[PDB]
Design a protein around this ligand. Structure first.
Ligand SMILES: Nc1nc2c(ncn2[C@@H]2O[C@H](CO)[C@@H](O)[C@H]2OP(=O)(O)O)c(=O)[nH]1
Ligand SMILES: [Ca+2]
Length: 104
């Protein structure tokens, strides 16, 4: 079973932890990758009731299992905060336009 299901993509807790660790290290070093400059601030326009505190940052999580290093980011994202606490896993899949919905 999937710990997180983003549309058709299946992720385990270990998948999220690996992705999060990569994104947080780049955040701490002040570096970015990709055309959309990940990781970057996640403003939470959606108004998700996250249990951890702001500020939030989004970083792509890939269905291939590899860590994001540039190129197409896909539709899925891991959202973490300044303390490297996981806020949630979201996706553009099943959401209109550039909006997000939570992965179940
Ligand atoms: N939907 C959405 N997009 C956000 C949010 N915070 C930042 N963004 C960025 O705002 C722009 C319009 O949605 C996009 O560049 C999007 O970035 P990503 O596309 O990299 O997610 C947010 O809370 N919700
Ligand atoms: Ca996996």
């Amino acid at each position: 079973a999937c710990d997180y299901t983003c549309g058709s993509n299946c992720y385990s807790s270990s998948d999220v932890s690996t992705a999060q660790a990569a994104g947080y290290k780049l955040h701490e070093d002040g570096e970015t990758v990709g055309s959309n400059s990940y990781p970057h601030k996640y403003n939470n326009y959606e108004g998700f009731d996250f249990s951890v505190s702001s500020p939030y940052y989004e970083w792509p999580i890939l269905s291939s299992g590899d860590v994001y290093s540039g190129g197409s980011p896909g539709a899925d994202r891991t959202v973490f905060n300044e303390n490297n606490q996981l806020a949630g896993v979201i996706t553009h899949t099943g959401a209109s336009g550039n909006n997000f919905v939570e992965c179940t």
